[PDB]
Design a protein around this motif. Structure first.
Motif, PDB file in Angstrom:
ATOM      1  N   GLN A   6      16.393  24.232 140.535  1.00  0.00           N
ATOM      2  CA  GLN A   6      16.348  24.409 142.193  1.00  0.00           C
ATOM      3  C   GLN A   6      15.161  23.775 142.244  1.00  0.00           C
ATOM      4  O   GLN A   6      14.059  24.555 142.518  1.00  0.00           O
ATOM      5  N   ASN A   7      14.856  22.474 143.235  1.00  0.00           N
ATOM      6  CA  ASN A   7      13.598  22.378 143.538  1.00  0.00           C
ATOM      7  C   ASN A   7      13.050  22.637 144.451  1.00  0.00           C
ATOM      8  O   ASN A   7      12.947  21.663 145.209  1.00  0.00           O
ATOM      9  N   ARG A   8      12.776  23.604 144.520  1.00  0.00           N
ATOM     10  CA  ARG A   8      12.106  24.125 145.791  1.00  0.00           C
ATOM     11  C   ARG A   8      10.868  24.071 146.249  1.00  0.00           C
ATOM     12  O   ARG A   8      10.098  25.051 147.335  1.00  0.00           O
ATOM     13  N   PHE A   9      10.448  23.115 145.627  1.00  0.00           N
ATOM     14  CA  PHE A   9       8.361  22.986 145.484  1.00  0.00           C
ATOM     15  C   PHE A   9       7.930  21.866 145.192  1.00  0.00           C
ATOM     16  O   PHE A   9       8.832  21.178 144.185  1.00  0.00           O
ATOM     17  N   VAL A  10       6.926  21.833 145.499  1.00  0.00           N
ATOM     18  CA  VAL A  10       6.206  20.387 145.151  1.00  0.00           C
ATOM     19  C   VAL A  10       5.489  20.490 144.473  1.00  0.00           C
ATOM     20  O   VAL A  10       4.231  21.627 144.817  1.00  0.00           O
ATOM     21  N   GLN A  11       5.256  19.898 143.654  1.00  0.00           N
ATOM     22  CA  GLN A  11       4.220  19.373 142.328  1.00  0.00           C
ATOM     23  C   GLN A  11       3.880  17.785 142.371  1.00  0.00           C
ATOM     24  O   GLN A  11       2.702  17.947 141.253  1.00  0.00           O
ATOM     25  N   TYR A  12       4.710  17.096 142.780  1.00  0.00           N
ATOM     26  CA  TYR A  12       4.275  15.717 142.068  1.00  0.00           C
ATOM     27  C   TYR A  12       3.630  15.591 143.024  1.00  0.00           C
ATOM     28  O   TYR A  12       2.160  14.868 141.857  1.00  0.00           O
ATOM     29  N   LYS A  13       2.632  15.712 144.261  1.00  0.00           N
ATOM     30  CA  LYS A  13       2.875  15.896 144.972  1.00  0.00           C
ATOM     31  C   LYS A  13       3.894  14.928 145.859  1.00  0.00           C
ATOM     32  O   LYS A  13       3.992  13.685 145.075  1.00  0.00           O
TER      33      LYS A  13
END
Lengths: 48, 155
Positions: A6-13
């Motif tokens: 579940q991609n509840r979060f941003v790290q690419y960003k």
């Protein structure tokens, strides 16, 4: 099915989509100037 | 400049107030009005206070200059409309530099009421229409109306 994270979060960003945005200047709605015909006590129209 | 002249009743053109020091504006109202001094000096020292870096005592001492429109002046009611348009513009200007404690309307009320007395004598000044046009931008409406009253200024 695949057990997706579940991609509840941003790290690419989203920073490619972020710093491409140029940000408005709306500090004063008449564009950062007090609009007055009384405070021009001075005038450069005189010589020179 | 830094000291302009305050005329007396008897042996006039003798006394001065040096503006490098900051006197209280209310005693200025006194020392002007025991001398029956012309209304022009009230504008002049208001400009002195403003060039002294003051926007609030500058705008409240002139409230005491709203009383003396034609006191002993022989038709200086043109001078009173010049006085009152300064408050009709700088109440609404000082409302834009509002602080955390008062309301915008806490100055807009005084701006709007005093503008009504400003239009009792004179109509469509180069600043009358400015006061109501800049009144419009505060509220986000009558915006084309404000543009029209500014274009009333050009005509």
């Amino acid at each position: 099915t695949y057990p997706f994270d579940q991609n509840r979060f941003v790290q690419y960003k989203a920073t490619s989509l972020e710093k491409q945005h140029k940000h408005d200047l709306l500090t004063e709605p008449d564009l950062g100037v007090t609009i007055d015909l009384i405070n021009p006590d001075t005038y450069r129209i005189d010589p020179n | 400049r830094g000291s302009i002249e305050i005329p007396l009743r008897d042996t006039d053109e003798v006394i001065e107030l040096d503006f490098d020091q900051l006197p209280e504006g209310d005693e200025v109202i006194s020392i002007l009005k025991q001398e029956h001094t012309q209304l022009h000096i009230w504008i002049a020292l208001a400009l002195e206070y403003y060039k002294q870096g003051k926007t609030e005592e500058f705008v409240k001492l002139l409230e005491a200059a709203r009383i003396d429109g034609n006191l002993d002046y022989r038709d200086h009611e043109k001078d009173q409309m010049t006085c009152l348009d300064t408050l009709a513009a700088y109440y609404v200007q000082q409302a834009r530099k509002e602080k955390n404690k008062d309301n915008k309307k806490d100055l807009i009320t005084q701006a709007t009421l005093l503008y009504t007395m400003a239009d009792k004598i004179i109509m469509y000044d180069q600043n009358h229409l400015l006061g109501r046009a800049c009144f419009c931008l505060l509220e986000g409406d009558k915006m084309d109306q404000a543009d029209a009253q500014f274009h009333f200024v050009l005509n």
